[PDB]
């Protein structure tokens, strides 16, 4: 995809004025679009943004008029976002003393999309209207607009100051007019293009998830010498790392190429400097002495895989494969090849014949030529929309460590007494996250840690934001909502305090030391 975005923002007078328990509808919308702009300001998507202001005391548009096409400024054209747009959003924008129409701004904005979408490429398109419903209008072009939103293929998102579960009669009637427009566009799904400033500030709280694909890999799943099936796996969990590395730069010039990194060499006989292209040969180490290989004779003797293989070795129970031992960098999801309906029936047979025996597969793998051969467990599971069979690496005999940890049931010197046991008996029920508020036999899932975004990247982009908008100032604390997300606090801490209070007495708590920081010489 390459997207179009058009922020269509009401800046009339009235949205400055409010229900006193909130920020003004003007600054609420300004904050929403701030909390948005930041996202693609960092994320490397190919998406163009435009700004349109309406209720402006002047006007600037390609389509200017006296009553319609008026009190509108097409403030920023449809291109990739940048920090100056974010500064102008955060600090420049003003309410007009006058008023204007969102149907008005919509026609101009939609015509600007009809200009911009020709001379440069796109796939999907949006228009986004933010207002307090102070627009007064004739219900003019609406059927042609809804028809044209299909013929231009642009969806409309609409943003408002109040709830969908003290507002003016003008806001109630305006919302029924917005409903009527989205019912006309999309029917029952259409109202899910409508958002409150309340729920959206309570949803735009964070930077984006890092967007990455798993690359395609074509292969041939092979249960025996004659029988092969087409397979194409995708990585599914990968412990994810940031795209752009920290570049190295001179302190006064700020140019990323005024440093050259000389990896020079020394023999220790008073600084005889070697040439790597002639005189340096890798060695390995063999007991009390070194032995020279050649990098060019290791390749003569090295174990070479005969192919880019995937082939099953045999099968055995879930019992043969305990939890602990799993050893991988990644998990694959190992799927029937695209548009192979023979593979689709054959692999659905394979995994449906593993669903019932508790049997698992054991498989030789190799991603590509020269890379290391590989072993392990191709473990099946089921979801209503597809069969799962993940592949995971398992240890070789030298990857596995065996130690006799002194075994704890010999409890005579480390006594677990009746009163200690009768304290713990309440802890581990009392501090439950999973609560039984259900009849599905699935508990509330009160802390869904696999849905949380990585605090490492939230923290990184949050610093890059602050040092972009305040370019010589010191770094901020952790933004507080990150702790509020990363804790597990609410009702569980209200339950815990008393069962924890009897741990403090029934168990001993002998000392540990502490260590210091820049506090070892910092003020007050």
């Amino acid at each position: 995809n390459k997207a179009a975005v058009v922020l269509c923002m009401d800046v009339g007078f009235t949205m400055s004025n409010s229900i006193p328990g909130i920020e003004s509808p003007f600054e609420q919308a300004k904050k929403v679009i701030t909390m948005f702009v930041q996202r693609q300001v960092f994320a490397e998507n190919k998406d163009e943004i435009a700004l349109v202001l309406f209720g402006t005391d002047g006007t600037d548009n390609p389509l200017s008029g006296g009553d319609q096409y008026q009190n509108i400024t097409v403030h920023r054209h449809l291109m990739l976002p940048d920090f100056d747009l974010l500064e102008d959003i955060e600090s420049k924008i003003q309410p007009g003393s006058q008023q204007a129409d969102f149907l008005d701004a919509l026609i101009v904005s939609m015509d600007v999309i009809q200009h911009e979408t020709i001379g440069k490429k796109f796939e999907k398109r949006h228009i986004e209207i933010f207002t307090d419903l102070s627009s007064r209008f004739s219900k003019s072009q609406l059927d042609i607009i809804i028809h044209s939103l299909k013929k231009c293929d642009i969806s409309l998102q609409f943003f408002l100051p109040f709830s969908l579960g003290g507002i003016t009669e003008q806001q109630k009637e305006g919302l029924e007019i917005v409903k009527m427009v989205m019912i006309s566009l999309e029917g029952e799904d259409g109202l899910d293009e409508i958002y409150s400033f309340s729920e959206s500030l309570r949803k735009l709280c964070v930077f984006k998830k890092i967007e990455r694909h798993s690359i395609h890999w074509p292969c041939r799943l092979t249960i025996g010498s004659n029988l092969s099936i087409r397979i194409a796996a995708y990585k599914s969990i990968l412990q994810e790392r940031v795209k752009k590395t920290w570049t190295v730069v001179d302190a006064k010039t700020l140019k990323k190429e005024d440093i050259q990194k000389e990896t020079v060499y020394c023999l220790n006989d008073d600084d005889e400097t070697e040439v790597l292209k002639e005189d340096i040969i890798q060695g390995f180490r063999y007991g009390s002495d070194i032995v020279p290989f050649s990098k060019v004779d290791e390749e003569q003797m090295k174990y070479k895989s005969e192919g880019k293989c995937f082939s099953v070795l045999g099968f055995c129970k879930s019992s043969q494969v305990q939890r602990r031992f799993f050893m991988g960098n990644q998990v694959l999801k190992v799927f029937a090849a695209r548009d192979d309906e023979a593979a689709a029936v054959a692999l659905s047979s394979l995994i449906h014949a593993l669903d019932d025996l508790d049997m698992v597969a054991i498989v030789r793998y190799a991603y590509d030529k020269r890379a290391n051969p590989q072993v392990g467990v191709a473990f099946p599971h089921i979801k209503h929309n597809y069969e799962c069979l993940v592949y995971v690496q398992l240890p070789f005999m030298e990857d596995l460590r065996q130690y006799m940890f002194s075994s704890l049931k010999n409890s005579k010197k480390y006594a677990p007494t009746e009163a200690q046991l009768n304290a713990v008996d309440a802890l581990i029920d009392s501090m439950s996250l999973a609560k039984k508020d259900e009849k599905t036999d699935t508990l509330e899932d009160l802390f869904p840690t696999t849905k949380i975004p990585n605090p490492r990247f939230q923290r990184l982009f949050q610093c890059l934001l602050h040092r972009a908008l305040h370019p010589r100032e010191p770094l901020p604390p952790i933004q507080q909502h990150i702790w509020n997300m990363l804790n597990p606090p609410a009702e569980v801490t209200t339950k815990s305090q008393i069962p924890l209070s009897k741990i403090k007495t029934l168990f001993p708590l002998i000392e540990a030391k502490k260590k210091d920081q820049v506090t070892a010489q910092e003020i007050f």
Binding site: R39, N45, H126, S155, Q157, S200, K203, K208
Partner: peptide, 7 residues
Amino acid sequence: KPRGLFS
């Protein structure tokens, strides 16, 4: 699944 502001 969501898009636009929810991209």
